[model samples]
Target: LTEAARLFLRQERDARQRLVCPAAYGEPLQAAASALGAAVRLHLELGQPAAAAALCLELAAALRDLGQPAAAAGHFQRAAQLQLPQLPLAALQALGEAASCQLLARDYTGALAVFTRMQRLAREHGSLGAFSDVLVRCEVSRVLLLLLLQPPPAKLLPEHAQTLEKYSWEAFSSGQLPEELFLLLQSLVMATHEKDTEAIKSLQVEMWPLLTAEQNHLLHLVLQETISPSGQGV
Candidate 1:
């Protein structure tokens, strides 16, 4: 399984490189998507959810670039699902991906449901990252919903203070990618970078805490006996 995972990783990497020169590869987007999906499937089957999720992310990116938001969301959702099935963080991450895609596809109702689910799961888990991600999704969803349901330049919604607090707590848990941390960060970045003041503020409230926590965690890990100290220490 490990060997297969490695091989799939190589194939995925090669496909990605080829995608950089689409004309050279003919049907580059399609080929990359297919290869990426295959790699993700192999990783998932090998019980490497993290790897699978990563590949799914790449596949989704490729699909989105190809102007298939719906398909991209499907792959991202699949990747999130294949990660930690029993974990709220994983579920929420998947829902976020789906919600974003829905928003882009102009499926307001679907997007709302997904964002709501993500919020509920984050609240349930009490994860800082999850909480932050949910609100970010909510903020985005509200804009889309307002635009679709009402008219131009939607009214800004009130902030969810408590939710932001919860997000701060989770974000500070570790420096290293904790299972689905990368997804959470990716979601947060995507949700905030689009000129949403609320999302940006929410992100600011949580970013440093998470970074500090991760630094502390890494320090602890490095202090452990298994890892070799710097040569200067000897």
Candidate 2:
């Protein structure tokens, strides 16, 4: 039901349509994203969930590309809810993405809630568990994300944050990880905490190879934002 969801194109549309959206409107990418958002809403009202979800997914992707994660996160949330019944895998994927979206937005409480949900869902039927790549990436993310907001926030429920953190470390410790990953985190995080620009970028470059694409994206965004603080220009 979000603007990002409005970009859905329905089940009957051509598969290539999913790949390329030849829109005939919008001045800039942001303006075009707004147009897609409006379209997604219209599609949903017509009972086209599949089409709507696809559009929303794309819209969210576009926003992310444009460095608008808060906007993208809304669509990520909507896509997950809308596709939960129709596409289980896509739904979970969207949910996983929502966590990253919030992380870049520096909304730790929101990030924790989604991460906890991911943990629960992983246990239910899927194995997005400790051995899973994203589960490990999320754990790495949790530590760095926490460093971004030391002492954490009061907004994240005391109970919720506690559960999320406990699971994060438990999953991480249970599995063996590269020692360099730990070193990268320790050295870089101190730089972030102390506001060292050169060190953070240098470390990110070195650590990029050590991470999955998803983790790299998350870490890159956080590092870049630490330098500018208004990376999205939102």
Candidate 3:
């Protein structure tokens, strides 16, 4: 029975790889994705979560390439959960990707949660460069997301308050960020609080060179909402 299952799993994996055409979507790509799912389930049944986790990563990237970031984000999270017990750093990588996908999908809260997870996991398990690298991107993204959400000061979550608080004081003067980037981020946060649209725009222009594409998108949204007045807050 086990042999038969393994053979079936191998066939599905091969078919998945052969059919996954990032450039060629539609029927072929759909077949590939389904085959990948099948193989992943087979691995789960066989108690080989690590293998399933690998397939999840592959499928997640393929989905992202195919412009299905929302679905891709879930698969990346699944891969993280599957690998978390044995590979903490690899799990951080998966969570980081998941956060990016969530942002691309416009799931701001989802991205924030994943980035927060990445921060905790990286600090717990990552080495010097690795830890700083994760911290920089996650903090950048988290700060942008908070700006975009504009959670009311009265109802602010403790976690996000702490994130903003770090930027507000000398406590965040770590070498994790370039001095210019750090100053711009702090300025942007202050500008948001004050509803200073001009300062926000100028900061956005200056920070554009430093931020990732997704973070830039979030900043753009923040500027948009700041001027138009969302009349809402997270």
Candidate 4:
């Protein structure tokens, strides 16, 4: 069942990437979402809550691709809250997804709390993978949220920047790029270092053609409101 769920999730993700433009593949995206959701339900019915939680994370990713942050956050949160025996890795992964969803929804405080919980869980379980993963996510969330609040650069410690950069590189190399939270962190970094507007502009040009209309609009808004702003007011 787990192997089947993994296969379905891979297909779902492929469908999402192919259906990036809503006009071209909106129905297919919706179908993929439903399929992933059904796969999750099946996992739960088979008494595999951890697998179900993982699928929920995938479903949330699909929702995010469809530009539905609120719905995505709900699924991610439910996945995080799923209790399973002897699956600390899966639980930590769910918490990480939940933290990412909270960041997308601008629930910075909530995101902080979730990441904190993740960190504690990682520590308790002594899982190096979970520890490193959650630590980077926590730092990334902290830095991005602080950037959004527009704190002075001097007030921002070099350690915070270093932590974000370090974790970002690690996370990226670990094949975790498509997840919304890290993508948002990358977006925040680009917005912060707008001295290289050309860099972000290039990214926008590449991404815009591959996103849904709603996602493109949101990306534009992020650029205008967050990236284009010159002052600390954001």
The 10 consecutive residues of candidate 4 with the worst lDDT sum are 169-178
Error of 4 at 85 (Å): 4.5
Better of 3 and 4 by TM-score: 3
**Number of colliding residue pairs in model 2:** 11
Highest TM-score: give the candidate number: 3
Model 1 regions more than 4 Å off:
1-26, 86-94, 127-133, 136-234
lDDT of 1 by residue, 108-176 (tens): 566655665565556556735546645544543433243233322343323323323223324543222
Angstrom error at residue 14, model 3: 17
Q: What number of clashing residue pairs does each candidate have, in the order they appear?
A: 5, 11, 0, 0
- Candidate 2 lDDT, 1-234, residue by residue in tens: 353333332321222244444552323453454546776777778788876777778878767755678879889989888887666568778888888787678777678567666655545545233336445565566655554544446666564465344433233333334567866766765677677888988988999888877567667766867866663766
Model 1 local distance difference test score:
0.52
Global lDDT of each model?
A: 0.52, 0.65, 0.79, 0.59
Native-referenced Cα lDDT, model 4 = 0.59
Q: 7 in model 4: Cα distance from truth in Å?
A: 11
User: For model 3, how does the per-residue alpha-carbon lDDT over 63-155 read when each residue is reduced to its tens digit?
Assistant: 786578999999999999999979877888899899889888888888888988887777767645777888888888889888888778897
lDDT, model 1, position 40: 70
Reference-based TM-score of each model: 0.47, 0.55, 0.81, 0.47
- Model 2 TM-score is 0.55
Task: Please identify model 3 stretches exceeding 4 Å from their true place.
Answer: 1-33, 169-172, 230-234
